[PDB]
Design a protein around this ligand. Sequence first.
Ligand SMILES: N[C@@H](Cc1ccc(O)cc1)C(=O)O
Ligand SMILES: N[C@@H](Cc1ccc(O)cc1)C(=O)O
Ligand SMILES: [Cl-]
Lengths: 348, 358
Amino acid sequence: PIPEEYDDTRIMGYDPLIPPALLQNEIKASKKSLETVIKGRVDASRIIGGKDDRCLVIVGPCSIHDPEAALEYANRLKKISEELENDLVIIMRAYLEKGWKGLINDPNVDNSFDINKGLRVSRKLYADLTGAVGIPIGSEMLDTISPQYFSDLLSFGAVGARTTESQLHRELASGLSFPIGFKNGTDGNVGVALDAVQASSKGHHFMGVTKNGLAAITTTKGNDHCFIILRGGKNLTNYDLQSVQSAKSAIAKSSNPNIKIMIDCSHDNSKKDYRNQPAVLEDVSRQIEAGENALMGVMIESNINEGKQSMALKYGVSITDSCVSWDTTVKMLNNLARAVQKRRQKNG
Amino acid sequence: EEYDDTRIMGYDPLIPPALLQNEIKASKKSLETVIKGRVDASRIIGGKDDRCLVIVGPCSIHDPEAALEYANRLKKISEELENDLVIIMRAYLEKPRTTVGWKGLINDPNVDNSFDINKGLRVSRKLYADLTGAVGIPIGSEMLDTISPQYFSDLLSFGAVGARTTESQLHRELASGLSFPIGFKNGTDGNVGVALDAVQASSKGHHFMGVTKNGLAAITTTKGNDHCFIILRGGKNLTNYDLQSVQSAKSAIAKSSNPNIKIMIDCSHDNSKKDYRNQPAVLEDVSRQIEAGENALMGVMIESNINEGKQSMPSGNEGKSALKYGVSITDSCVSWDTTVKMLNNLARAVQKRRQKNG
Ligand SMILES: N[C@@H](Cc1ccc(O)cc1)C(=O)O
Ligand SMILES: N[C@@H](Cc1ccc(O)cc1)C(=O)O
Ligand SMILES: [Cl-]
């Protein structure tokens, strides 16, 4: 006789989720939303596959905390996306979590926990970005259960530096309906990202849930639309030319010698300082301007206002990591858009 | 549906975990073996017992009949060396990563390139109940996802997080809510810092997406796991079982938030250059630092079987009839006779360290 002190000894409690098929029906994806989602996946895939000379730009706040502040940011970002449509493909970074447990964990930013209210707030936000304004969005892929609530509204997915080697995330990447980007290792390792791209191109079996919320094993087809992201190491930056050449050499000896490179301009490449973000973009832009076709895009941590605060809170200011201003951002995107114009001039 | 599940071929609903636990009930003696294995370990992680925690067994269990004979052998020697060693059997149901060959007991229980997850879950769970109950040996597994542990956690005494998942926040959250000690292996480049960071993160409460006991999607609230440690395992082209590497980690633990983190050495995998013949030489070195006085060494990890070497099973004869008995079909293990030499030398090691602490 053992009094169930062998099971869930470290589980404070379970909070059952709303079934994804029901959340997808309560907050439905409008036709204009799915039009934006499919267009974002196709436009990004053409740049990844080498069929388009434009640059894929993943720009947005490090984390989304205020839905109304993010919806006003997207209206600014969709305007500039239409003006630079000939050279840039802009996908807004709509990350839900990284002080702040996230939008799915805490919708009211008051340190509570309402996982169901978080899913409705995050999905209705996703439905408004792709529908009300009409801009493609991308999120971070954290587990094998959350994507079942947002996959019909996502056009891009990122696997962080600390999960690129995770076999579970490589399996899930093989079953996601949008292009995936693998960041290099936390020490600057490029090889682990090439291994992730190759592994995710194969069919796999991962443990997820059905649309009704039932534990089930999933059979995947493989994701042939993947790329690597250079975000630097804990002690190094790899956005410079010698580092791109080092990555280009590693790709040439891999199983996918057509892999293109995206450069994170924030995080460790900018020493976590937003003022170095424009100077980092100038370097990669000049590499592109010289005619480097292996360079595919960039990542920009931008916001309505530059800087970072804590959690009575400033409007349009990030709460996590560090962002650049909007007046800064439009210059970064304009300077990059000219570099893309100069690249295809050398390709003519 | 040109936008949803465009790369999903099909779902296979799982039997609810409570139903499997009702079909393959955990015996009273099974549970008694599980709880004792957990506390026996934890006392070594916390520095309350100078014994050595041994995680020994095959790389993957493809033959339940062969595993049951190995466990009875392991149970006999574990009782002989109970004064010095705490032995937990390796009962890994899945070889991860590399796609060539077998896919694990869960996905392929018949060992013939099949897919039968519900039949594999019944076979795997029954094997766990027989090891903990019929023979009565603690067992440990690899923590791969946040759904499968709900099927075996009531029968597990130890969990392992691979080198490719130590940095993953998802597996750090899961470790914070598991009912047994967890061991984090260093990075695939030999980096020990990510292992200390994982042990620290898993000591706090977290939230992770899992399933209820009936297989329904739910978010969990964890209490925090303070029975975690690091596993020195090696790098892509290096070994870290030597005296230089152990003390580098020991000084790194000294600057962590908990200087009581003990070190376990993986005697196989990259520390043996994926060679079963180098496992005794690696353990012999580990045994010496233990016997010279080093209390930071808490245990070892050995890949062992009834017979040494390896084999393959992919084509031709259509299954188990062409396999050798007690030979692993993944990686490479030492024979049982070698394992007896290895455990007996490590036992005398724990003895002479105990004399140096009086
Ligand atoms: N619906 C997801 C695929 C998926 C399936 C099951 C999961 O558990 C997670 C994701 C997509 O279209 O991308
Ligand atoms: N039941 C597990 C904890 C757990 C909970 C939910 C899961 O989805 C997975 C694992 C244990 O006691 O160790
Ligand atoms: Cl958390």
